[PDB]
Amino acid sequence: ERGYSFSLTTFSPSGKLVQIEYALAAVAGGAPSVGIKAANGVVLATEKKQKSILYDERSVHKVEPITKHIGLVYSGMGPDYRVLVHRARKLAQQYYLVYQEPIPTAQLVQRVASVMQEYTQSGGVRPFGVSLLICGWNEGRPYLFQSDPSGAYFAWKATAMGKNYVNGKTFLEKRYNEDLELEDAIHTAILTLKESFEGQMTEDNIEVGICNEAGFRRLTPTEVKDYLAAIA
């Protein structure tokens, strides 16, 4: 067949893009998560509860590496995430096959944001419904970026996304400063995940990945159980 070739999103008489206005609420119903850069690298912490005991939490993952030194999490819905994940996995390689170098995080965001805004204008498609948190320690300094379904982005010191981020960012405003370490951002990241978490925060209720100057990696529930140990 073919597509539709007409944009289903128009400006309101109030001048608002209404499907984007609803997609922000679709992000707002997303799972709560936070991420903090502190002077050596970035800590990404999400909140992942299985709906029943029948699930394998060791099957799927929220914390997703993009390259050697870049990780990424989200706050939104499931199936929209993995597609643009795979797109970013490609875009790193189309950078690398040209430049023989890993991509700067900003240079990745310049392409991903263009994919999302290019997608929210094109004909016959609903826009995306996730927001992203992107980490990376390129050229020494760590980086912490955030996108939206409209296709913009921001450079945060620390922020919150998902449910109750309007309270979590007030917690981070009363919590963070410039001089912290990665394990400190681990501890206050558990402290802000416990603000909106359930009654029991075990080793599998969360998933935390970190950047270093050694690069991005993801935690196992052994040392993540050590982090939930002696917490709060």
Partner 1 sequence: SYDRAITVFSPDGHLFQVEYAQEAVKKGSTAVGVRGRDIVVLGVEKKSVAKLQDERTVRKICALDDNVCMAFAGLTADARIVINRARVECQSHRLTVEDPVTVEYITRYIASLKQRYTQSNGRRPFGISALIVGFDFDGTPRLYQTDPSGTYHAWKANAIGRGAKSVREFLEKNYTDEAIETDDLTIKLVIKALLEVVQSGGKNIELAVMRRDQSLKILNPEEIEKYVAEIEKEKEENE
Beta carbon nearer to partner 1, 29 or 123: 123
5 makes contact with partner 1 (CB under 8 A) = yes
Give yes or no for residue 1 binding partner 1 (CB under 8 A): no
3-state secondary structure of 134: strand
3-state secondary structure of 198: coil
**3 state SS of 33:** strand
Q: Which of 6, 54, 59, 230 binds partner 1 (CB under 8 A)?
A: 6
Query: Do the Cβ atoms of 105 and 139 come closer than 8 Å?
Result: no
Site string for partner 1, 87-126 (x = CB under 8 A): ------------------------------------x---
Token pair belonging to 150 = 């409209």
Starting from the edge strand earliest in sequence, which strands make up the sheet with 158-161, in order?
A: 158-161, 33-37, 42-47, 206-212, 215-218
Give the nearest distance from C-beta 11 to partner 1 in angstroms: 17
* Residue placing its CB nearer to partner 1 in the complex, 5 or 222: 5
CB-hemisphere CA count at 13 Å for 64? 21
- Residue from 2, 51, 58, 174 touching partner 1 (CB under 8 A): that is 2
Interface residues toward partner 1, by CB under 8 A: 2, 5-6, 123
